[PDB]
Structure 1
């Protein structure tokens, strides 16, 4: 299970290696693209042909505040091959750049998307849409509460338009933390936890919504159309998980070829001190939740000794990527041949620790080729810059 070295990246924080890099790594056609901060804080872009181990790197004109692990880089390609980059935010004015040509590691100047409510950004994320268009999501904090703002890029028009200004509504009462995925049909999947207070221990529940029409109209998994915006009272609950359950925020989710959502997270049971990894999914008929791990070591959120997970699905076959102090903080794989039967195997994918690392993966490679590639780097949360690798993952023997 092979480990392709890219270049040295910043390792003194987990900025290159958070679960919410959407994306760190992206394939189009026969090429794969990557982004990270180098040891000196510069935004580096890379590309390769997928059949090669040789990366072409470009140190761009931009830097980021690498001492803050929130200040991540997200990238994506549109249907014409232009790279879109957004980076370096913890409640700051939008940093957004496009490549100057398709398939080329040359960034233009920073530019607005719509110019509206772009003053206080955190957590930029890109998703591909049908027709080569893009979705952008970010957390806007300008109101005093983190609000989900969603834009659509038309690749033909070379233009961004707002889609949703108020999709999840905390009613000046509660907070919300979300993750998304665009499936192989072009449907946007959305899931989130609520948080009653400002403190992480009041994280509760997993809610869900989807949109088939690029974010305009929204549906529940049970088929009912949403009245917007989505509040505590009308949200579809994928799973109930109470406050003070060590429920974590900002994880990941995926979907299978049938458009069914799967959500990967962790929390602990009422009668346990031990948080466990979970999978929450809708099979076209109903919601399910299951425990993936069999941990025995407590921790509390009130660095975290386990990583927030990533998942990919192939017709009920599940690859569930994690990192855990119980397994020496290696890159680890929890694999299920069939999600519905719940027989999991556990396999370490690295023989060395990656400490603060959380997984991000090449979402488009998995969709287009059913190959699972991870962004892998040893980070901490003074440590010399460590190699960034791409690791291909296959089912275990």
Structure 2
């Protein structure tokens, strides 16, 4: 496997602040291909300057040929909270509508949707008028909408879109799912699907394949990040209403963080494992988790694998040259190709201030981690475009550079693979 070509584009100047607001691990998602176009969302500084930001949405044609980016600026909502939780997630439903939810740390939902199905019936003009106003509810559904953190979207097989988030706080919170119908344009409440018990679950993402929805998490006792413990897993066969553990045992609704039956690896507190890192269902139905810990005596990224025979394995990701991360260092992701043979670790290196692209193969039990490429000059939790990789064999990664404001840019990097 080789990188046929490497290309990059600078899409904006990052915003100034001691917190990172662009390029955050739990953006789900930041960079999305739908049809012949790729979309990206990020904050850029408003004319009022420091601590005033607008959400931007970029689009570019990627098929049959790659076109230039164009951007719209949502200049009717000013982000002002210098808090790294307050990121943007985007989703695109099967009616072609683009959804955005953003700017939360334990506050009411902020959500907006495009007026029309702009990703399906593609308009000539890319302007802010394409979007409806910010609202603080989900039409057709019901609260609670506050105190909300961590909006995550997941597109389903019938064109519908899940929106998932935590209601509560670090160390005492629960998570909820809502479902947007592409046929009616209405949201519906699926209710609380995971319930804390003087703690909160921190999921790594949502993954969906062939009618099944997969998630993994750690449990946090207090606002101190050293109090994460456990690696847990569950899946649903009905888009988040009913859940099962790794042994196919049906779980209570909601899943309780006190239910040990979803635990797949014992990791104590003070292991230097961080919440909300990465996960992946590969196209062959193998489930993967990316975390980190100090338990070997060295800080190392860790790969958890749910094998076909039901067994789980854990193996350090330690290819030559990769510096292992401690608790507060930037978090990585796992990507997979259409065939399911290639597993990509998109791993920020805290020493090099760059993002490494490493590859392992299913034929070698994913133990053959090899350096494949690098994105230089990043201070980012890298995020990729699942659909572009599956459809075109191009690994496309959104990054925040390292360096100082206003030199520090936002970029998209495309690694064309010889798949």
Q: TM-score, normalised by structure 1?
A: 0.90
Over 3 Å counting, the alpha-carbon distance change for 1:49 and 1:322 in structure 2 is same
Offset of residue 341 of structure 1: 4.9
* 8 Å CA contact retained: 1:10, 1:66: no
Give yes or no for the alignment of 1:71 onto 2:86: yes
Aligned mates of 2:223, 2:300 — CA distance in 1: 24
Give yes or no for the alignment of 1:139 onto 2:151: no
Aligned mates of 1:259, 1:215 — CA distance in 2: 17
The correspondence for 1:365, drawn from 388, 398, 414, is: 388
Offset of residue 213 of structure 1: 1.1
Look up the SS of the partner of 1:157 in the other structure: coil
Offset of residue 81 of structure 1: 0.9
Give yes or no for the alignment of 1:185 onto 2:210: yes
- Deviates most, 79-88 or 3-12: 3-12
Offset of residue 162 of structure 1: 0.8
Give yes or no for the alignment of 1:255 onto 2:305: no
Partner of 2:61: 49
Partner of 2:414: 392
* 8 Å CA contact retained: 2:39, 2:57: yes
* 8 Å CA contact retained: 2:57, 2:71: yes
* 5+ residue gaps, structure 1: none
Aligned mates of 2:284, 2:291 — CA distance in 1: 22
Offset of residue 71 of structure 1: 0.5
Q: CA RMSD in A?
A: 2.4
Offset of residue 115 of structure 1: 4.0
Over 3 Å counting, the alpha-carbon distance change for 1:345 and 1:300 in structure 2 is closer
Look up the SS of the partner of 2:206 in the other structure: strand
Look up the SS of the partner of 1:281 in the other structure: strand
Give yes or no for the alignment of 1:210 onto 2:235: yes
Aligned mates of 1:260, 1:299 — CA distance in 2: 25
The correspondence for 2:30, drawn from 11, 24, 29, is: 24
* 8 Å CA contact retained: 2:103, 2:110: yes
Partner of 2:306: 282
Over 3 Å counting, the alpha-carbon distance change for 1:341 and 1:37 in structure 2 is closer
* 8 Å CA contact retained: 1:11, 1:385: no
Offset of residue 119 of structure 1: 2.3
Aligned mates of 2:261, 2:251 — CA distance in 1: 8
Look up the SS of the partner of 1:244 in the other structure: coil
Aligned mates of 2:88, 2:16 — CA distance in 1: 15
How big is each residue's C-alpha offset from its partner over 1:225-277, in whole Å with a ceiling of 9 and x where there is no partner?
Answer: 222332333432222211111011011211112322111111111x51x3100
How big is each residue's C-alpha offset from its partner over 1:27-50, in whole Å with a ceiling of 9 and x where there is no partner?
Answer: 111101110001331111110101
How big is each residue's C-alpha offset from its partner over 1:129-188, in whole Å with a ceiling of 9 and x where there is no partner?
Answer: 1111000001111798221111111111111111132x22222x3222112333331421
Look up the SS of the partner of 2:255 in the other structure: coil
* 8 Å CA contact retained: 2:212, 2:236: yes
* 5+ residue gaps, structure 2: 1-5, 47-52
Over 3 Å counting, the alpha-carbon distance change for 1:308 and 1:318 in structure 2 is same
Greater strand percent: which structure?
2
Q: How many residues are treated as equivalent by the alignment? A: 386
Offset of residue 219 of structure 1: 1.6
How big is each residue's C-alpha offset from its partner over 1:307-351, in whole Å with a ceiling of 9 and x where there is no partner?
Answer: 21110124242100011133x11121121133615111124522x
Q: TM-score, normalised by structure 2?
A: 0.85
* 8 Å CA contact retained: 2:322, 2:349: no
Offset of residue 93 of structure 1: 1.2
Give yes or no for the alignment of 1:99 onto 2:139: no
Over 3 Å counting, the alpha-carbon distance change for 1:322 and 1:65 in structure 2 is farther
* 8 Å CA contact retained: 1:267, 1:276: yes
